[PDB]
Amino acid sequence: MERKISRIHLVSEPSITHFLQVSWEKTLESGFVITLTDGHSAWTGTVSESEISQEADDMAMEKGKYVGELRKALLSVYTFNFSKESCYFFFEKNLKDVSFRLGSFNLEKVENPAEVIRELICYCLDTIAENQAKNEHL
Amino acid sequence: MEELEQGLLMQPWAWLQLAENSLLAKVFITKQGYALLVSDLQQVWHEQVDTSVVSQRAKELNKRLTAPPAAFLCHLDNLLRPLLKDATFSCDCVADALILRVRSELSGLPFYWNFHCMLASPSLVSQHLIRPLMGMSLALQCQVRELATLLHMKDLEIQDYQESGATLIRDRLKTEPFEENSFLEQFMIEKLPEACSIGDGKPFVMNLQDLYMAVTTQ
Amino acid sequence: MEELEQGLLMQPWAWLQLAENSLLAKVFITKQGYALLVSDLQQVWHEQVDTSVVSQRAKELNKRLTAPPAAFLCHLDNLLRPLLKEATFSCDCVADALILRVRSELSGLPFYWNFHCMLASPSLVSQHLIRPLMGMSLALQCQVRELATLLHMKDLEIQDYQESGATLIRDRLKTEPFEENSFLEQFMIEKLPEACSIGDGKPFVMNLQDLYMAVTTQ
Q1: Using CB atoms, which chains have 3+ pairs under 8 A with A?
Q2: Residue B65 and residue B76: Cα distance in Å, rounded?
Q3: Is the CB of residue B2 less than 8 Å from the CB of residue B32?
Q4: Which intervals of the chain are annotated as region Globular head (chain C)?
Q5: Is B199 on the interface with A (CB under 8 A)?
Q6: Contact criterion met (CB below 8 Å) for C124 and C45
């Protein structure tokens, strides 16, 4: 499905906020693609499960909350820390008596940094289609 | 001496977090571990493991447990009063081994911990589930005799004050004289058998918990 | 088999004649059958076992002669039939090893006898000899409160303390109305040594036999 920008604010770098334009393919553990940008350089990462899906199978997969954890992890909440140099996005999960890690998003970078920005401009167009003109219709 | 098992013994017979019939699982978490005596009155479990040995014992009993060892002490210490240790749990009094796991499936990452109660040696079985049970039987009968000396004239006073002045007007609530010797046969075989529902020693915990607090020394 | 042992409630408990430590033993008055249990408060051996695990030590003193296994069970309980219906035995809790420190004398001539029992199997120690063991507490667990609170609802017609006089009941043996809460803290101060050392068992046995003939007959 189309790469939709889910803007996220890093606790390490809240000034230039990131944009987890995550094109999740029907799941977050058996095939998904995340294109992360800070609005300046686009780490369009056609990511696979060879980098995150093992996070499930290596660190006590219990029986409480995982889908919601990763779902809220792709929006603006944990210590979102995307490494600009390594194109790798990580954050720490906090809860009772133990603070696990959740995401090891190694979000690759394409040569075009304006891809997510131009997509965000198509987004300014439809978001722009979000109040007054079809206000005028209805 | 031996404040861990002594605290276990002085800990009232308490209901551990269970989803089935209540067992004699009076957990007493100490500052240096715990002595856990779980009993269904069909088998004896004596989990007297300190907070240090239990950490390595979980590595050989728990299927997958990678948790901080320091956090284990804090996780256990809240169960000093047998009310909560982590939702609720359930002792497994189905076979020779008892399990305290509640299983769901969401691939999540909460904090989960379980108690693994090993088999108790016959010496411990005697010292915790026959000798103490005999002790509470003696205590209950000592409670019963001072009642019996108080059960022969007080139960007749109501009948003595029944018609002697202010004759009864509510005849629907009349009662018969009561005595300990009469109760030995007037109720044991007439109405008791219909209400005699015992099972595998189930009637133990509803009246031997508040009393079991006064065994602090032994 | 079950028809033979279902009648076990024919008679109340019989006290072990040691007069030193409160030990509970059962007596079975039935032809072609017996039920002996040793409860020395250190290792309670339940003799209701099989011939598999016992057959490795019980044949270390026989070379070319054999005796029936039922001979011993149909001996002790048979000799007690025409005797009951200074007998002092000693069994300290410290000596875990099976070298009995017994100073018993009955007829002058010593007779070799001891608590000949191996390790108690977990299945047979609690799954079949506790339901009749809890029956003695059934006359308590379901009736301690029935005797305690009975002074309360029987005081309704005794509420004439204003319209007929101003005097109490007797005020000569008058103690507190013995209830559940009366015996809670009472165990702390006076019954604490009883929990420490049970005593001899005389208040523990004869004091429950009057409540045991029909406790769970039906």
Answers
A1: B
A2: 15
A3: no
A4: 1-129
A5: no
A6: no
